[PDB]
Amino acid sequence: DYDLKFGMNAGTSSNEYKAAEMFAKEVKEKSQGKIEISLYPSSQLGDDRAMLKQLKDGSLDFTFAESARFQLFYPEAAVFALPYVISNYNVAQKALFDTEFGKDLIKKMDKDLGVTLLSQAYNGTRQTTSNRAINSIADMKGLKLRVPNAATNLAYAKYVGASPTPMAFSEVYLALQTNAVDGQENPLAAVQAQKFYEVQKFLAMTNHILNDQLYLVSNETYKELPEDLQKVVKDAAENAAKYHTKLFVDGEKDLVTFFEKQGVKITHPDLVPFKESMKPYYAEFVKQTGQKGESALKQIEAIN
Ligand SMILES: [Zn+2]
Numbered sequence: 001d002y003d004l005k006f007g008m009n010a011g012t013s014s015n016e017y018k019a020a021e022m023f024a025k026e027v028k029e030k031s032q033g034k035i036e037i038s039l040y041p042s043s044q045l046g047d048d049r050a051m052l053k054q055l056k057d058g059s060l061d062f063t064f065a066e067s068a069r070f071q072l073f074y075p076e077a078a079v080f081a082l083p084y085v086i087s088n089y090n091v092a093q094k095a096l097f098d099t100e101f102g103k104d105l106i107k108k109m110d111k112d113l114g115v116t117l118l119s120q121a122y123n124g125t126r127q128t129t130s131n132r133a134i135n136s137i138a139d140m141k142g143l144k145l146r147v148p149n150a151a152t153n154l155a156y157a158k159y160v161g162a163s164p165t166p167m168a169f170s171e172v173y174l175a176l177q178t179n180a181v182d183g184q185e186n187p188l189a190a191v192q193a194q195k196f197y198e199v200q201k202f203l204a205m206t207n208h209i210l211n212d213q214l215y216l217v218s219n220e221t222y223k224e225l226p227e228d229l230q231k232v233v234k235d236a237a238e239n240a241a242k243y244h245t246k247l248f249v250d251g252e253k254d255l256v257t258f259f260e261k262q263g264v265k266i267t268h269p270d271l272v273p274f275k276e277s278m279k280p281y282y283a284e285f286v287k288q289t290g291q292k293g294e295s296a297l298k299q300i301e302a303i304n
Contacts (some may be wrong), residue, residue: 006062007040015247023240056114056218084275119241129200130183
């Protein structure tokens with residue numbers, strides 16, 4: 001029998017975990033018991049980068065990773081988290097699987113990083129909560145928008161006309177409550193997790209950054225497996241991914257609905273001038289990441 005480990009940063013109550021449970025179920029049934037995958041949630045084995053390294057050395061069998069996270073190896077890969085570059089999840093898939101940039105990055109993942117990409121999932125979009133309504137981009141002006149201390153997030157707050165306000169995540173509730181800070185952005189699960197709906201009366205569907213999740217196997221594991229058991233593992237991660245995606249899609253819907261119950265009001269501002277405002281940031285991406293950057297941007301922009 002094959003005794004396989006699967007690590008991930010997410011927790012037992014997460015969509016990522018519920019879905020890896022499925023993947024593990026199916027690999028056990030359909031390998032007629034030969035393979036069995038244990039779960040190591042909550043960064044138990046290290047952070048993402050350590051788990052990625054462990055996939056390369058073969059000491060961890062599976063792990064999760066966003067596609068933007070690969071910019072640690074290839075800087076042009078941060079294209080995936082550039083604000084308004086990935087309009088939707090259909091863009092994230094065609095970007096990864098149906099472009100020369102993305103086809104090639106999967107080939108790099110393998111050749112350089114010892115990692116086989118089995119499947120991709122949707123892991124949620126970042127949206128914007130505030131003490132007052134965002135009906136358009138003209139509302140962004142004046143807002144103390146809390147972002148984490150990450151270039152793409154600050155570039156979002158900055159270029160839309162907001163006032164970016166990095167602060168520690170645990171300080172964010174009271175900052176919002178006492179209106180020291182006006183809004184924040186983050187996936188909807190954080191809004192709920194951190195109770196921001198209590199201190200934020202408005203939620204804007206700003207669709208500004210989108211997160212994905214890759215089902216990754218160690219090359220040392222995958223190719224030591226027999227051809228039939230490889231396909232069992234691959235099929236199961238394509239099934240698990242479709243589920244994972246549907247968990248996030250369906251749960252985002254229910255969370256909008258939940259928030260409305262809490263007295264939050266939702267807006268759907270026009271995002272054409274939001275993405276127009278980013279062109280200065282894109283210029284700076286292509287400057288830093290050069291020719292590889294420019295074609296990634298242009299090939300992904302060329303999508304739907
Ligand atoms: Zn065993």
